[PDB]
Amino acid sequence: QQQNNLLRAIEAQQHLLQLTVWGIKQLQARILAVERYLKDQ
Amino acid sequence: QQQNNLLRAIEAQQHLLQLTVWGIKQLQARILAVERYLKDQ
Amino acid sequence: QQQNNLLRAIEAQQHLLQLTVWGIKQLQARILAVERYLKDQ
Amino acid sequence: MTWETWEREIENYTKQIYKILEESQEQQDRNEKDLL
Amino acid sequence: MTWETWEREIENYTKQIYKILEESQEQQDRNEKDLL
Amino acid sequence: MTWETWEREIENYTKQIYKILEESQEQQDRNEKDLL
């Protein structure tokens, strides 16, 4: 079946999306830490 | 119908993608501001 | 055919995802450079 | 838009997608059993 | 690749996706009316 | 999770997706030739 396939492709991209979200959150925290470091000076 | 469903799943992921784009742009601006702050010193 | 269409929509979003990955990597490198700059002080 | 809202919206679309995937799959298994 | 181009390419793929979604949906409504 | 692993997992899902796209397309061309 092809519907099931497309469905799995979407599922795989969903996992990719979750990884990009993780990365964005990591970067946000790191930028925030730097901003705070400089403000604290 | 299942085609319509897959189509909506893709639509939803599109909204997710738009959110990750917003986040990336926010971070780019914030990193750039920090880079400029340090260069201006 | 509609299956082929959904398949192309997914392909297009895949290209978008690749672009967001590029952006995230760029930002990670830039944040890391800033972190190192401050640590080196 | 703020980061708190951003996180919540991401979660909302994510948890939706999964529930939608299972839906389409649910019907597909239903239809497969129909046509046997 | 640069950030200006990045933004433009993102916009180009996004605006395409939406137009593609509506296309597939267009045909689907067309076919539904066909088989009534 | 770390950035090295992150990159590798991204690559793993990406290279999978492409291989999956070609799969679905492979069968579709196969089926089109079937029904001619």
Side-chain angles (χ1 to χ4, degrees), chain A residues 1-2 5-6 8-9 12-13 15-16 19-20 22-24 26-27 30, chain F residues 1-3 6 9-10 13-14 16-17 20-21 23-24 27-29 31:
Chain A
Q1 169 68 271
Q2 295 174 339
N5 286 338
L6 295 184
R8 295 325 192 195
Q13 286 180 321
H15 291 301
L16 257 179
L19 287 169
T20 66
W22 173 89
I24 290 164
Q26 289 281 320
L27 296 188
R30 283 165 65 192
Chain F
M1 180 64 53
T2 63
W3 284 98
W6 180 84
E9 292 241 82
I10 295 282
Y13 277 119
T14 299
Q16 163 164 46
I17 290 158
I20 291 181
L21 271 66
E23 294 163 47
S24 304
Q27 185 181 134
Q28 187 52 257
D29 291 326
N31 294 341

PDB file of all heavy atoms in Angstrom, chain A residues 1-2 5-6 8-9 12-13 15-16 19-20 22-24 26-27 30, chain F residues 1-3 6 9-10 13-14 16-17 20-21 23-24 27-29 31:
ATOM      1  N   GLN A   1       0.829  -1.198   0.000  1.00  0.00           N
ATOM      2  CA  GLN A   1       0.000   0.000   0.000  1.00  0.00           C
ATOM      3  C   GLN A   1       0.868   1.254   0.000  1.00  0.00           C
ATOM      4  O   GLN A   1       1.932   1.287   0.616  1.00  0.00           O
ATOM      5  CB  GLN A   1      -0.935   0.003   1.212  1.00  0.00           C
ATOM      6  CG  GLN A   1      -1.655   1.325   1.445  1.00  0.00           C
ATOM      7  CD  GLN A   1      -2.675   1.644   0.369  1.00  0.00           C
ATOM      8  OE1 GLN A   1      -2.349   2.259  -0.647  1.00  0.00           O
ATOM      9  NE2 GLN A   1      -3.919   1.233   0.589  1.00  0.00           N
ATOM     10  N   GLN A   2       0.404   2.286  -0.696  1.00  0.00           N
ATOM     11  CA  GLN A   2       1.164   3.522  -0.833  1.00  0.00           C
ATOM     12  C   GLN A   2       0.782   4.552   0.220  1.00  0.00           C
ATOM     13  O   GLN A   2       1.616   5.348   0.652  1.00  0.00           O
ATOM     14  CB  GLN A   2       0.950   4.103  -2.222  1.00  0.00           C
ATOM     15  CG  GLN A   2       1.497   3.236  -3.324  1.00  0.00           C
ATOM     16  CD  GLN A   2       1.128   3.771  -4.684  1.00  0.00           C
ATOM     17  OE1 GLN A   2       0.175   4.538  -4.823  1.00  0.00           O
ATOM     18  NE2 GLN A   2       1.883   3.378  -5.697  1.00  0.00           N
ATOM     19  N   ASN A   5       2.802   4.110   3.150  1.00  0.00           N
ATOM     20  CA  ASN A   5       4.155   4.604   2.913  1.00  0.00           C
ATOM     21  C   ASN A   5       4.255   6.103   3.159  1.00  0.00           C
ATOM     22  O   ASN A   5       5.070   6.553   3.969  1.00  0.00           O
ATOM     23  CB  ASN A   5       4.619   4.274   1.495  1.00  0.00           C
ATOM     24  CG  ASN A   5       4.954   2.808   1.323  1.00  0.00           C
ATOM     25  OD1 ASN A   5       5.228   2.107   2.296  1.00  0.00           O
ATOM     26  ND2 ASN A   5       4.938   2.337   0.081  1.00  0.00           N
ATOM     27  N   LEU A   6       3.430   6.878   2.464  1.00  0.00           N
ATOM     28  CA  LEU A   6       3.387   8.317   2.683  1.00  0.00           C
ATOM     29  C   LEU A   6       3.257   8.598   4.172  1.00  0.00           C
ATOM     30  O   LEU A   6       3.897   9.507   4.704  1.00  0.00           O
ATOM     31  CB  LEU A   6       2.213   8.951   1.933  1.00  0.00           C
ATOM     32  CG  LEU A   6       2.244   8.886   0.405  1.00  0.00           C
ATOM     33  CD1 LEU A   6       1.064   9.652  -0.169  1.00  0.00           C
ATOM     34  CD2 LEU A   6       3.555   9.430  -0.145  1.00  0.00           C
ATOM     35  N   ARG A   8       4.318   6.851   6.655  1.00  0.00           N
ATOM     36  CA  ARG A   8       5.589   6.604   7.327  1.00  0.00           C
ATOM     37  C   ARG A   8       6.613   7.694   7.012  1.00  0.00           C
ATOM     38  O   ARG A   8       7.432   8.053   7.862  1.00  0.00           O
ATOM     39  CB  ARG A   8       6.149   5.233   6.939  1.00  0.00           C
ATOM     40  CG  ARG A   8       5.299   4.056   7.402  1.00  0.00           C
ATOM     41  CD  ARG A   8       4.651   4.336   8.747  1.00  0.00           C
ATOM     42  NE  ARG A   8       4.074   3.138   9.350  1.00  0.00           N
ATOM     43  CZ  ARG A   8       3.220   3.148  10.369  1.00  0.00           C
ATOM     44  NH1 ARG A   8       2.825   4.296  10.908  1.00  0.00           N
ATOM     45  NH2 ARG A   8       2.757   2.006  10.851  1.00  0.00           N
ATOM     46  N   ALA A   9       6.573   8.212   5.789  1.00  0.00           N
ATOM     47  CA  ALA A   9       7.458   9.300   5.394  1.00  0.00           C
ATOM     48  C   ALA A   9       7.175  10.515   6.263  1.00  0.00           C
ATOM     49  O   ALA A   9       8.093  11.183   6.759  1.00  0.00           O
ATOM     50  CB  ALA A   9       7.255   9.638   3.930  1.00  0.00           C
ATOM     51  N   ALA A  12       8.529   9.946   9.701  1.00  0.00           N
ATOM     52  CA  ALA A  12       9.975  10.134   9.751  1.00  0.00           C
ATOM     53  C   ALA A  12      10.335  11.619   9.803  1.00  0.00           C
ATOM     54  O   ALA A  12      11.215  12.031  10.567  1.00  0.00           O
ATOM     55  CB  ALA A  12      10.634   9.473   8.554  1.00  0.00           C
ATOM     56  N   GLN A  13       9.656  12.422   8.990  1.00  0.00           N
ATOM     57  CA  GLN A  13       9.879  13.866   9.002  1.00  0.00           C
ATOM     58  C   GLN A  13       9.470  14.461  10.342  1.00  0.00           C
ATOM     59  O   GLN A  13      10.054  15.449  10.798  1.00  0.00           O
ATOM     60  CB  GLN A  13       9.113  14.540   7.866  1.00  0.00           C
ATOM     61  CG  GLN A  13       9.738  14.306   6.507  1.00  0.00           C
ATOM     62  CD  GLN A  13       8.979  14.981   5.389  1.00  0.00           C
ATOM     63  OE1 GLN A  13       7.746  15.009   5.384  1.00  0.00           O
ATOM     64  NE2 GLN A  13       9.711  15.529   4.426  1.00  0.00           N
ATOM     65  N   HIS A  15       9.925  13.002  13.183  1.00  0.00           N
ATOM     66  CA  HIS A  15      11.080  12.769  14.047  1.00  0.00           C
ATOM     67  C   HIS A  15      12.172  13.804  13.775  1.00  0.00           C
ATOM     68  O   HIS A  15      12.812  14.315  14.706  1.00  0.00           O
ATOM     69  CB  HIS A  15      11.624  11.354  13.853  1.00  0.00           C
ATOM     70  CG  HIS A  15      10.716  10.286  14.375  1.00  0.00           C
ATOM     71  ND1 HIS A  15      10.315  10.229  15.692  1.00  0.00           N
ATOM     72  CD2 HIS A  15      10.130   9.228  13.759  1.00  0.00           C
ATOM     73  CE1 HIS A  15       9.522   9.188  15.867  1.00  0.00           C
ATOM     74  NE2 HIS A  15       9.394   8.565  14.709  1.00  0.00           N
ATOM     75  N   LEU A  16      12.386  14.115  12.500  1.00  0.00           N
ATOM     76  CA  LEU A  16      13.331  15.161  12.115  1.00  0.00           C
ATOM     77  C   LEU A  16      12.933  16.478  12.753  1.00  0.00           C
ATOM     78  O   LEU A  16      13.770  17.181  13.329  1.00  0.00           O
ATOM     79  CB  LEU A  16      13.364  15.336  10.597  1.00  0.00           C
ATOM     80  CG  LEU A  16      14.542  14.741   9.830  1.00  0.00           C
ATOM     81  CD1 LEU A  16      14.370  14.998   8.340  1.00  0.00           C
ATOM     82  CD2 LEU A  16      15.852  15.318  10.321  1.00  0.00           C
ATOM     83  N   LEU A  19      13.820  16.758  16.292  1.00  0.00           N
ATOM     84  CA  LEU A  19      15.250  16.994  16.474  1.00  0.00           C
ATOM     85  C   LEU A  19      15.593  18.470  16.267  1.00  0.00           C
ATOM     86  O   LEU A  19      16.394  19.053  17.020  1.00  0.00           O
ATOM     87  CB  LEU A  19      16.060  16.116  15.518  1.00  0.00           C
ATOM     88  CG  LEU A  19      16.113  14.631  15.884  1.00  0.00           C
ATOM     89  CD1 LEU A  19      16.707  13.815  14.750  1.00  0.00           C
ATOM     90  CD2 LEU A  19      16.915  14.424  17.159  1.00  0.00           C
ATOM     91  N   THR A  20      14.998  19.097  15.257  1.00  0.00           N
ATOM     92  CA  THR A  20      15.264  20.516  15.027  1.00  0.00           C
ATOM     93  C   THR A  20      14.723  21.349  16.183  1.00  0.00           C
ATOM     94  O   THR A  20      15.336  22.341  16.574  1.00  0.00           O
ATOM     95  CB  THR A  20      14.709  21.030  13.679  1.00  0.00           C
ATOM     96  OG1 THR A  20      13.278  20.976  13.677  1.00  0.00           O
ATOM     97  CG2 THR A  20      15.257  20.211  12.527  1.00  0.00           C
ATOM     98  N   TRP A  22      14.584  20.331  19.342  1.00  0.00           N
ATOM     99  CA  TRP A  22      15.585  20.146  20.396  1.00  0.00           C
ATOM    100  C   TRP A  22      16.755  21.109  20.202  1.00  0.00           C
ATOM    101  O   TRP A  22      17.227  21.754  21.153  1.00  0.00           O
ATOM    102  CB  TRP A  22      16.117  18.710  20.396  1.00  0.00           C
ATOM    103  CG  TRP A  22      17.270  18.494  21.343  1.00  0.00           C
ATOM    104  CD1 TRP A  22      17.194  18.132  22.656  1.00  0.00           C
ATOM    105  CD2 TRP A  22      18.670  18.630  21.046  1.00  0.00           C
ATOM    106  NE1 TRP A  22      18.454  18.033  23.195  1.00  0.00           N
ATOM    107  CE2 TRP A  22      19.377  18.331  22.226  1.00  0.00           C
ATOM    108  CE3 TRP A  22      19.389  18.970  19.896  1.00  0.00           C
ATOM    109  CZ2 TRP A  22      20.771  18.365  22.292  1.00  0.00           C
ATOM    110  CZ3 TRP A  22      20.774  19.001  19.962  1.00  0.00           C
ATOM    111  CH2 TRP A  22      21.449  18.702  21.152  1.00  0.00           C
ATOM    112  N   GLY A  23      17.233  21.193  18.966  1.00  0.00           N
ATOM    113  CA  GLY A  23      18.377  22.026  18.643  1.00  0.00           C
ATOM    114  C   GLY A  23      18.092  23.491  18.896  1.00  0.00           C
ATOM    115  O   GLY A  23      18.911  24.213  19.468  1.00  0.00           O
ATOM    116  N   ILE A  24      16.922  23.937  18.460  1.00  0.00           N
ATOM    117  CA  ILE A  24      16.520  25.326  18.638  1.00  0.00           C
ATOM    118  C   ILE A  24      16.446  25.675  20.124  1.00  0.00           C
ATOM    119  O   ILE A  24      16.913  26.739  20.545  1.00  0.00           O
ATOM    120  CB  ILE A  24      15.169  25.599  17.949  1.00  0.00           C
ATOM    121  CG1 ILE A  24      15.349  25.564  16.432  1.00  0.00           C
ATOM    122  CG2 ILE A  24      14.610  26.943  18.366  1.00  0.00           C
ATOM    123  CD1 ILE A  24      14.036  25.429  15.663  1.00  0.00           C
ATOM    124  N   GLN A  26      18.071  24.205  22.583  1.00  0.00           N
ATOM    125  CA  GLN A  26      19.438  24.211  23.111  1.00  0.00           C
ATOM    126  C   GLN A  26      20.094  25.556  22.844  1.00  0.00           C
ATOM    127  O   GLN A  26      20.732  26.157  23.723  1.00  0.00           O
ATOM    128  CB  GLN A  26      20.273  23.114  22.451  1.00  0.00           C
ATOM    129  CG  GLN A  26      19.903  21.706  22.867  1.00  0.00           C
ATOM    130  CD  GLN A  26      20.470  21.332  24.220  1.00  0.00           C
ATOM    131  OE1 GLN A  26      21.611  21.674  24.545  1.00  0.00           O
ATOM    132  NE2 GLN A  26      19.674  20.640  25.022  1.00  0.00           N
ATOM    133  N   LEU A  27      19.956  26.021  21.612  1.00  0.00           N
ATOM    134  CA  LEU A  27      20.558  27.281  21.203  1.00  0.00           C
ATOM    135  C   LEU A  27      19.937  28.454  21.948  1.00  0.00           C
ATOM    136  O   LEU A  27      20.641  29.389  22.339  1.00  0.00           O
ATOM    137  CB  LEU A  27      20.422  27.470  19.694  1.00  0.00           C
ATOM    138  CG  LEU A  27      21.167  26.446  18.834  1.00  0.00           C
ATOM    139  CD1 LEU A  27      21.117  26.840  17.364  1.00  0.00           C
ATOM    140  CD2 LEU A  27      22.606  26.245  19.296  1.00  0.00           C
ATOM    141  N   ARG A  30      21.422  28.601  25.322  1.00  0.00           N
ATOM    142  CA  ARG A  30      22.828  29.014  25.290  1.00  0.00           C
ATOM    143  C   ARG A  30      22.989  30.499  24.999  1.00  0.00           C
ATOM    144  O   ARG A  30      23.848  31.170  25.594  1.00  0.00           O
ATOM    145  CB  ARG A  30      23.618  28.172  24.296  1.00  0.00           C
ATOM    146  CG  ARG A  30      23.927  26.802  24.852  1.00  0.00           C
ATOM    147  CD  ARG A  30      24.380  25.848  23.790  1.00  0.00           C
ATOM    148  NE  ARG A  30      25.653  26.237  23.196  1.00  0.00           N
ATOM    149  CZ  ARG A  30      26.129  25.686  22.092  1.00  0.00           C
ATOM    150  NH1 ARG A  30      25.421  24.737  21.497  1.00  0.00           N
ATOM    151  NH2 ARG A  30      27.294  26.076  21.594  1.00  0.00           N
TER     152      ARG A  30
ATOM    153  N   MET F   1      21.601  13.429  24.407  1.00  0.00           N
ATOM    154  CA  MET F   1      21.743  13.921  23.044  1.00  0.00           C
ATOM    155  C   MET F   1      22.859  14.956  22.975  1.00  0.00           C
ATOM    156  O   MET F   1      23.000  15.795  23.866  1.00  0.00           O
ATOM    157  CB  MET F   1      20.422  14.531  22.568  1.00  0.00           C
ATOM    158  CG  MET F   1      20.446  15.089  21.148  1.00  0.00           C
ATOM    159  SD  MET F   1      20.733  13.857  19.858  1.00  0.00           S
ATOM    160  CE  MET F   1      19.473  12.639  20.224  1.00  0.00           C
ATOM    161  N   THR F   2      23.658  14.881  21.914  1.00  0.00           N
ATOM    162  CA  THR F   2      24.747  15.824  21.690  1.00  0.00           C
ATOM    163  C   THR F   2      24.717  16.256  20.229  1.00  0.00           C
ATOM    164  O   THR F   2      23.982  15.680  19.434  1.00  0.00           O
ATOM    165  CB  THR F   2      26.106  15.187  22.016  1.00  0.00           C
ATOM    166  OG1 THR F   2      26.345  14.088  21.130  1.00  0.00           O
ATOM    167  CG2 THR F   2      26.132  14.693  23.456  1.00  0.00           C
ATOM    168  N   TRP F   3      25.510  17.260  19.868  1.00  0.00           N
ATOM    169  CA  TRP F   3      25.443  17.824  18.519  1.00  0.00           C
ATOM    170  C   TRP F   3      26.000  16.894  17.444  1.00  0.00           C
ATOM    171  O   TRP F   3      25.544  16.917  16.299  1.00  0.00           O
ATOM    172  CB  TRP F   3      26.120  19.197  18.471  1.00  0.00           C
ATOM    173  CG  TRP F   3      25.256  20.236  19.086  1.00  0.00           C
ATOM    174  CD1 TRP F   3      25.334  20.721  20.359  1.00  0.00           C
ATOM    175  CD2 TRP F   3      24.147  20.901  18.469  1.00  0.00           C
ATOM    176  NE1 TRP F   3      24.348  21.652  20.569  1.00  0.00           N
ATOM    177  CE2 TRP F   3      23.606  21.781  19.426  1.00  0.00           C
ATOM    178  CE3 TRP F   3      23.565  20.842  17.201  1.00  0.00           C
ATOM    179  CZ2 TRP F   3      22.513  22.599  19.151  1.00  0.00           C
ATOM    180  CZ3 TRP F   3      22.479  21.654  16.930  1.00  0.00           C
ATOM    181  CH2 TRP F   3      21.963  22.518  17.901  1.00  0.00           C
ATOM    182  N   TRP F   6      23.273  14.473  17.047  1.00  0.00           N
ATOM    183  CA  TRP F   6      22.185  15.218  16.430  1.00  0.00           C
ATOM    184  C   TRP F   6      22.375  15.257  14.922  1.00  0.00           C
ATOM    185  O   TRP F   6      21.462  14.939  14.161  1.00  0.00           O
ATOM    186  CB  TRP F   6      22.156  16.636  17.002  1.00  0.00           C
ATOM    187  CG  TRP F   6      21.079  17.528  16.465  1.00  0.00           C
ATOM    188  CD1 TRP F   6      19.789  17.609  16.897  1.00  0.00           C
ATOM    189  CD2 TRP F   6      21.215  18.505  15.425  1.00  0.00           C
ATOM    190  NE1 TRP F   6      19.108  18.567  16.183  1.00  0.00           N
ATOM    191  CE2 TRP F   6      19.961  19.129  15.270  1.00  0.00           C
ATOM    192  CE3 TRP F   6      22.275  18.911  14.608  1.00  0.00           C
ATOM    193  CZ2 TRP F   6      19.738  20.132  14.333  1.00  0.00           C
ATOM    194  CZ3 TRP F   6      22.047  19.903  13.671  1.00  0.00           C
ATOM    195  CH2 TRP F   6      20.790  20.500  13.543  1.00  0.00           C
ATOM    196  N   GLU F   9      21.842  11.724  13.409  1.00  0.00           N
ATOM    197  CA  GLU F   9      20.440  11.318  13.402  1.00  0.00           C
ATOM    198  C   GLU F   9      19.667  12.075  12.324  1.00  0.00           C
ATOM    199  O   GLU F   9      18.813  11.504  11.644  1.00  0.00           O
ATOM    200  CB  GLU F   9      19.808  11.556  14.775  1.00  0.00           C
ATOM    201  CG  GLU F   9      20.340  10.642  15.869  1.00  0.00           C
ATOM    202  CD  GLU F   9      19.261   9.764  16.471  1.00  0.00           C
ATOM    203  OE1 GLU F   9      18.940   8.717  15.870  1.00  0.00           O
ATOM    204  OE2 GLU F   9      18.732  10.122  17.546  1.00  0.00           O
ATOM    205  N   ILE F  10      19.968  13.361  12.173  1.00  0.00           N
ATOM    206  CA  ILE F  10      19.362  14.169  11.120  1.00  0.00           C
ATOM    207  C   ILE F  10      19.670  13.562   9.756  1.00  0.00           C
ATOM    208  O   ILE F  10      18.790  13.428   8.903  1.00  0.00           O
ATOM    209  CB  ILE F  10      19.906  15.609  11.129  1.00  0.00           C
ATOM    210  CG1 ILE F  10      19.510  16.335  12.420  1.00  0.00           C
ATOM    211  CG2 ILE F  10      19.407  16.365   9.907  1.00  0.00           C
ATOM    212  CD1 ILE F  10      18.084  16.823  12.455  1.00  0.00           C
ATOM    213  N   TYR F  13      17.733  10.178   9.256  1.00  0.00           N
ATOM    214  CA  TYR F  13      16.321  10.331   8.921  1.00  0.00           C
ATOM    215  C   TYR F  13      16.161  10.922   7.525  1.00  0.00           C
ATOM    216  O   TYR F  13      15.250  10.549   6.784  1.00  0.00           O
ATOM    217  CB  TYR F  13      15.610  11.217   9.946  1.00  0.00           C
ATOM    218  CG  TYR F  13      15.166  10.477  11.189  1.00  0.00           C
ATOM    219  CD1 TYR F  13      15.644  10.829  12.445  1.00  0.00           C
ATOM    220  CD2 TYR F  13      14.256   9.432  11.104  1.00  0.00           C
ATOM    221  CE1 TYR F  13      15.233  10.155  13.580  1.00  0.00           C
ATOM    222  CE2 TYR F  13      13.842   8.753  12.233  1.00  0.00           C
ATOM    223  CZ  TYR F  13      14.334   9.119  13.467  1.00  0.00           C
ATOM    224  OH  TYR F  13      13.922   8.445  14.592  1.00  0.00           O
ATOM    225  N   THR F  14      17.052  11.841   7.169  1.00  0.00           N
ATOM    226  CA  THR F  14      17.012  12.476   5.858  1.00  0.00           C
ATOM    227  C   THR F  14      17.236  11.441   4.759  1.00  0.00           C
ATOM    228  O   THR F  14      16.413  11.293   3.855  1.00  0.00           O
ATOM    229  CB  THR F  14      18.070  13.596   5.739  1.00  0.00           C
ATOM    230  OG1 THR F  14      17.810  14.605   6.720  1.00  0.00           O
ATOM    231  CG2 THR F  14      18.038  14.226   4.351  1.00  0.00           C
ATOM    232  N   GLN F  16      16.913   8.416   4.881  1.00  0.00           N
ATOM    233  CA  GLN F  16      15.819   7.452   4.901  1.00  0.00           C
ATOM    234  C   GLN F  16      14.637   7.990   4.113  1.00  0.00           C
ATOM    235  O   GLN F  16      14.095   7.315   3.238  1.00  0.00           O
ATOM    236  CB  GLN F  16      15.363   7.149   6.327  1.00  0.00           C
ATOM    237  CG  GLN F  16      13.985   6.491   6.382  1.00  0.00           C
ATOM    238  CD  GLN F  16      13.691   5.844   7.718  1.00  0.00           C
ATOM    239  OE1 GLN F  16      13.920   6.436   8.771  1.00  0.00           O
ATOM    240  NE2 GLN F  16      13.177   4.619   7.681  1.00  0.00           N
ATOM    241  N   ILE F  17      14.234   9.209   4.443  1.00  0.00           N
ATOM    242  CA  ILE F  17      13.101   9.840   3.789  1.00  0.00           C
ATOM    243  C   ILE F  17      13.247   9.755   2.274  1.00  0.00           C
ATOM    244  O   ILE F  17      12.336   9.303   1.590  1.00  0.00           O
ATOM    245  CB  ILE F  17      12.953  11.304   4.243  1.00  0.00           C
ATOM    246  CG1 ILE F  17      12.482  11.341   5.697  1.00  0.00           C
ATOM    247  CG2 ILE F  17      11.965  12.049   3.357  1.00  0.00           C
ATOM    248  CD1 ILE F  17      12.785  12.642   6.410  1.00  0.00           C
ATOM    249  N   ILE F  20      12.670   6.432   1.011  1.00  0.00           N
ATOM    250  CA  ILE F  20      11.256   6.088   1.133  1.00  0.00           C
ATOM    251  C   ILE F  20      10.436   6.743   0.024  1.00  0.00           C
ATOM    252  O   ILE F  20       9.547   6.115  -0.553  1.00  0.00           O
ATOM    253  CB  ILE F  20      10.684   6.496   2.506  1.00  0.00           C
ATOM    254  CG1 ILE F  20      11.291   5.626   3.609  1.00  0.00           C
ATOM    255  CG2 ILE F  20       9.167   6.358   2.514  1.00  0.00           C
ATOM    256  CD1 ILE F  20      10.766   5.926   5.000  1.00  0.00           C
ATOM    257  N   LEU F  21      10.733   8.006  -0.269  1.00  0.00           N
ATOM    258  CA  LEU F  21      10.068   8.710  -1.360  1.00  0.00           C
ATOM    259  C   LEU F  21      10.224   7.928  -2.657  1.00  0.00           C
ATOM    260  O   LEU F  21       9.252   7.711  -3.382  1.00  0.00           O
ATOM    261  CB  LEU F  21      10.646  10.117  -1.542  1.00  0.00           C
ATOM    262  CG  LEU F  21      10.019  11.253  -0.730  1.00  0.00           C
ATOM    263  CD1 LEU F  21      10.258  11.062   0.751  1.00  0.00           C
ATOM    264  CD2 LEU F  21      10.578  12.592  -1.176  1.00  0.00           C
ATOM    265  N   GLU F  23      10.844   4.850  -3.016  1.00  0.00           N
ATOM    266  CA  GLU F  23      10.150   3.574  -2.889  1.00  0.00           C
ATOM    267  C   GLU F  23       8.694   3.705  -3.314  1.00  0.00           C
ATOM    268  O   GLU F  23       8.226   2.982  -4.193  1.00  0.00           O
ATOM    269  CB  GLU F  23      10.217   3.080  -1.447  1.00  0.00           C
ATOM    270  CG  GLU F  23      11.612   2.729  -0.975  1.00  0.00           C
ATOM    271  CD  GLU F  23      11.706   2.641   0.534  1.00  0.00           C
ATOM    272  OE1 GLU F  23      10.832   2.004   1.157  1.00  0.00           O
ATOM    273  OE2 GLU F  23      12.658   3.214   1.101  1.00  0.00           O
ATOM    274  N   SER F  24       7.980   4.629  -2.678  1.00  0.00           N
ATOM    275  CA  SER F  24       6.578   4.865  -2.994  1.00  0.00           C
ATOM    276  C   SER F  24       6.419   5.192  -4.471  1.00  0.00           C
ATOM    277  O   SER F  24       5.471   4.746  -5.119  1.00  0.00           O
ATOM    278  CB  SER F  24       6.027   6.013  -2.150  1.00  0.00           C
ATOM    279  OG  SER F  24       6.201   5.760  -0.768  1.00  0.00           O
ATOM    280  N   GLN F  27       6.889   1.952  -6.677  1.00  0.00           N
ATOM    281  CA  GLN F  27       5.684   1.136  -6.742  1.00  0.00           C
ATOM    282  C   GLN F  27       4.625   1.789  -7.623  1.00  0.00           C
ATOM    283  O   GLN F  27       3.917   1.107  -8.365  1.00  0.00           O
ATOM    284  CB  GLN F  27       5.120   0.901  -5.338  1.00  0.00           C
ATOM    285  CG  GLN F  27       3.927  -0.048  -5.309  1.00  0.00           C
ATOM    286  CD  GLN F  27       3.355  -0.248  -3.917  1.00  0.00           C
ATOM    287  OE1 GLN F  27       2.140  -0.196  -3.723  1.00  0.00           O
ATOM    288  NE2 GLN F  27       4.226  -0.491  -2.943  1.00  0.00           N
ATOM    289  N   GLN F  28       4.521   3.112  -7.542  1.00  0.00           N
ATOM    290  CA  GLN F  28       3.527   3.851  -8.311  1.00  0.00           C
ATOM    291  C   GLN F  28       3.771   3.715  -9.811  1.00  0.00           C
ATOM    292  O   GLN F  28       2.833   3.526 -10.587  1.00  0.00           O
ATOM    293  CB  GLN F  28       3.526   5.326  -7.894  1.00  0.00           C
ATOM    294  CG  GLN F  28       2.405   6.159  -8.501  1.00  0.00           C
ATOM    295  CD  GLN F  28       1.033   5.547  -8.288  1.00  0.00           C
ATOM    296  OE1 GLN F  28       0.454   4.961  -9.203  1.00  0.00           O
ATOM    297  NE2 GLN F  28       0.502   5.686  -7.078  1.00  0.00           N
ATOM    298  N   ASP F  29       5.030   3.806 -10.219  1.00  0.00           N
ATOM    299  CA  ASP F  29       5.378   3.598 -11.615  1.00  0.00           C
ATOM    300  C   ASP F  29       5.132   2.144 -11.999  1.00  0.00           C
ATOM    301  O   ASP F  29       4.719   1.847 -13.121  1.00  0.00           O
ATOM    302  CB  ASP F  29       6.836   3.978 -11.861  1.00  0.00           C
ATOM    303  CG  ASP F  29       7.074   5.469 -11.735  1.00  0.00           C
ATOM    304  OD1 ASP F  29       6.166   6.246 -12.097  1.00  0.00           O
ATOM    305  OD2 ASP F  29       8.165   5.864 -11.269  1.00  0.00           O
ATOM    306  N   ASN F  31       2.830   0.149 -10.645  1.00  0.00           N
ATOM    307  CA  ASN F  31       1.387  -0.039 -10.725  1.00  0.00           C
ATOM    308  C   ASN F  31       0.786   0.633 -11.954  1.00  0.00           C
ATOM    309  O   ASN F  31      -0.167   0.124 -12.542  1.00  0.00           O
ATOM    310  CB  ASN F  31       0.708   0.487  -9.459  1.00  0.00           C
ATOM    311  CG  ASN F  31       1.073  -0.315  -8.226  1.00  0.00           C
ATOM    312  OD1 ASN F  31       1.540  -1.451  -8.323  1.00  0.00           O
ATOM    313  ND2 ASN F  31       0.854   0.271  -7.054  1.00  0.00           N
TER     314      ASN F  31
END
